[PDB]
């Protein structure tokens, strides 16, 4: 089961990388977000990641049933402390606002590289690095948090969506494996992880 699920997880990560390559963005991801001037590529990444999560969660529906916009903010006053992905609906169209500085902080946080757990052919090819894979995983999980909130907003009212924004205990109402919500490893159910605070 671990072998099967590890294969599935790395396959999903490969699909993630492949899609974000199909976006045809000549700028590197770290430089994608470092660039304060152009929000087009960053918002394209966010939109495509929302599409990726929506279709993996709901394979049977393909075409978008919604219209979305993006507002990119680069100041302290705007930044919500914990959810840099500001996602909401305004006047019949959803808006996914983003705090760029928080993300450029995240993807530049001295990623661990050493394995502290202590336990013709080849030539030029597609080569990746641990930092890039970790950054992609963090981005995918963050946008998954955003999509969880979007699904709560759709299945409830804005009042209940805000109360979820206050509590976050409301994720567990409907996201189970069902004929409507198609199972999915969700990219974070693969591992449990708890805190050892005093």
């Amino acid at each position: 089961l671990e072998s099967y699920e590890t294969l599935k997880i790395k396959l999903a990560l490969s699909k993630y990388m492949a899609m974000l390559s199909t976006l045809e963005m000549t700028q590197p991801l770290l430089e994608i977000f470092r660039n304060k001037a152009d929000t087009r590529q960053i918002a394209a990444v966010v939109f495509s990641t929302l599409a990726f999560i929506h279709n993996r969660f709901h394979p049977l529906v393909t075409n978008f049933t919604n219209k979305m916009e993006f507002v990119v903010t680069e100041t302290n006053d705007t930044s919500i402390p914990g959810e840099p992905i500001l996602f909401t609906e305004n006047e019949g169209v959803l808006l996914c606002s983003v705090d760029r500085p928080s993300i450029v902080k995240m993807l530049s946080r001295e990623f661990d590289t050493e394995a502290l757990v202590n336990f013709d052919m080849d030539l030029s090819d597609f080569s990746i690095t641990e930092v890039e894979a970790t950054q992609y995983l963090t981005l995918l999980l963050t946008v998954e948090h955003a999509y969880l909130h979007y699904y709560i907003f759709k299945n409830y009212g804005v009042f209940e969506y805000c109360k979820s924004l206050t509590d976050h205990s409301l994720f567990t109402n409907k996201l189970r494996s069902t004929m409507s919500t198609k199972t999915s490893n969700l990219l974070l159910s693969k591992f449990k992880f708890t805190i050892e605070d005093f």
Binding site: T6, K10, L11, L13, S14, M17, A18, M19, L23, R40, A43, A44, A51, F52, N55, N63, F64, K67, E69, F70, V71, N76, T78, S79, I80, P81, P84, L86, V93, S102, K105, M106, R109, D112, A115, V117, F126, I128, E130, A133, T134, L137, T138, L141, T166, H168, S169, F171, T172, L175, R176, S177, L188, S189, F191, K192, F193, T194, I195, D197
Partner: protein, 227 residues
């Protein structure tokens, strides 16, 4: 005697013509014409009534003065004297329109030596303990202010390089890379970013409780308690 009445009156004639025929024409005139007109009007005893009338036109244009018909009659006499124009097209209504034109012209800002604008940023440090929802609403009010930029609403199927060769090369290349280390790094980065944001905003964040709710509740009720 020290005051040249002739030039003052000559400039005042054009000024009153423009302001009485409702020809504002800010280009033509400057403050000098207005002040010469005012001095000439104040000079003779005849126009002291008009001077008193225009006194309250400087700042309080909502207070209608209370006056009788005889005072307005004498004021019309003074207006006909000053304009030197036949009273056929002159009446109290044109006088009040000219009064409004004078008030608007008077309240015009002119010039300043500039100023060191020390307003800028303050970083908005509350210096108190701060909640969650209050910060969320107060900040979101400024979040939704203006500037919606990105317009991607068409709705399109996600592009896929469905060929497995690109997938196979990558998937073989990812074999040596563990999942535990990557997931640890991601969680640790998220924790650091959240604590940084709470430190910057000085919000009363559950020390290790809310994100613990995230983790434990999500994992457990995914694994069991499905309902």
């Amino acid at each position: 005697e020290l005051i040249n009445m002739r030039r003052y009156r000559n400039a005042a004639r054009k000024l009153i013509h423009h302001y009485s025929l409702n020809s504002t024409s800010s280009t033509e005139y400057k403050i000098s014409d207005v002040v010469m007109t005012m001095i000439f009007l104040l000079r003779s005893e005849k126009y002291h009534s008009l001077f008193k009338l225009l006194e309250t036109t400087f700042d309080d244009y909502t207070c209608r003065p209370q006056m009788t018909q005889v005072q307005t009659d004498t004021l019309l006499d003074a207006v006909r004297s000053l304009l030197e124009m036949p009273s056929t097209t002159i009446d109290l209504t044109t006088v009040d329109i000219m009064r409004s034109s004078f008030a608007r012209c008077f309240n015009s800002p002119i010039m300043r030596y500039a100023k060191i604008v020390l307003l800028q940023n303050v970083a908005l440090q509350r210096d108190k303990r701060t909640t969650l929802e209050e910060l969320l609403i107060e900040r979101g009010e400024k979040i939704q202010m203006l500037q919606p930029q990105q317009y991607i609403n068409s709705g399109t199927e996600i592009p896929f390089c469905d060929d497995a060769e690109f997938l196979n090369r990558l998937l073989k290349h990812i074999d040596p890379y563990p999942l535990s280390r990557m997931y640890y790094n991601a969680a640790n980065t998220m924790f650091y970013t959240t604590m940084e944001n709470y430190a910057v905003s000085n919000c009363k964040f559950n020390i290790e409780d809310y994100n613990n709710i995230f983790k434990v509740m999500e994992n457990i009720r995914k694994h069991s308690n499905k309902n």
